[PDB]
Design a binder for these strands. Structure first.
Ligand SMILES: [Mg+2]
Ligand SMILES: [Mg+2]
Ligand SMILES: [Mg+2]
Length: 210
DNA sequence: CCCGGACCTGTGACAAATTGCCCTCAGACGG
DNA sequence: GCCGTCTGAGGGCAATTTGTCACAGGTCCGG
């Protein structure tokens, strides 16, 4: 199945994308890498890849596509837009998109890689952002360990403002995404909290391969 | 002493958003 | 050349998930 690879600069970039948008982003990165920035997505291919009907596939592409407008990417800083021209459909079931050519060197560079089947059942986009970052530290055999800072998680992933209250951080982001990964990917994940005084400052993730 | 106050935790409520589903009907193709 | 079938571009839904905040209940500090 398709092997996604990406610069660590992208894994650790600041952005806010939906699941549907991240799914499309994986194929653009695949298309570009197998080579101006103009990519294409076929409705019938997307539906087969992610096990959707053609109808719901069409709905997912169209709304994702119109929600890219105004979205920006930050590399730690420097900010760029994803698209420099609106999308358009020359043929029925076919969309043409114009990716910002200045993003190309950030896609292909110190790199991250995973097969698309590892993530295609994840639902929560924050859970995607997390499985990508853990992969950045994975070993050939399949294990790894990493300490991520809470302020850095909140910015890079662009968690919503109320998750600056730690019990909400735990309840609606950390626990759910650890469960999805354990339930929807071939990885088995655990964690522990690092504290300093009364404040919890980092999260230490351990994982192995099933 | 014990207070009011500034931290921290977890849970119950509700609002806002997203999920996979359902229905309609016209376009492109081929037999 | 007409029509039958597969597509996909639209319109919606109720059931769940995600985002937000009041309130109960722990600690330590300092005047
Ligand atoms: Mg959808
Ligand atoms: Mg009680
Ligand atoms: Mg009290």
């Amino acid at each position: 199945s398709p092997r996604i690879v990406q610069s660590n600069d992208l894994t650790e970039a600041a952005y806010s994308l939906s699941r549907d948008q991240k799914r499309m982003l994986y194929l653009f990165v695949d298309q570009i890498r197998k080579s101006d920035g103009i990519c294409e997505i076929h409705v019938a291919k997307y539906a087969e890849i992610f096990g959707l009907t053609s109808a719901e596939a069409s709905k997912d592409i169209r709304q994702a596509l119109k929600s890219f407008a105004g979205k920006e990417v930050v590399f730690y800083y420097e900010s760029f837009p994803w698209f420099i021209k609106p999308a358009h459909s020359p043929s029925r079931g076919l969309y043409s998109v114009h990716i910002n050519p200045y993003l190309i060197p950030f896609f292909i560079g110190r790199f991250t890689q995973f097969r698309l089947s590892e993530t295609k059942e994840i639902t929560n986009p924050y859970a995607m952002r997390l499985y990508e970052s853990l992969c950045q530290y994975r070993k050939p055999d399949g294990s790894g360990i990493v300490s991520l800072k809470i302020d850095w998680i909140i910015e890079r992933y662009q968690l919503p403002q109320s998750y600056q209250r730690m019990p909400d951080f735990r309840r609606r982001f950390l626990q759910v995404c650890v469960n999805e990964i354990n339930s929807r990917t071939p990885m088995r994940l655990s964690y522990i909290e690092k504290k300093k005084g009364r404040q919890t400052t980092h999260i230490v993730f351990s994982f192995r391969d099933i």
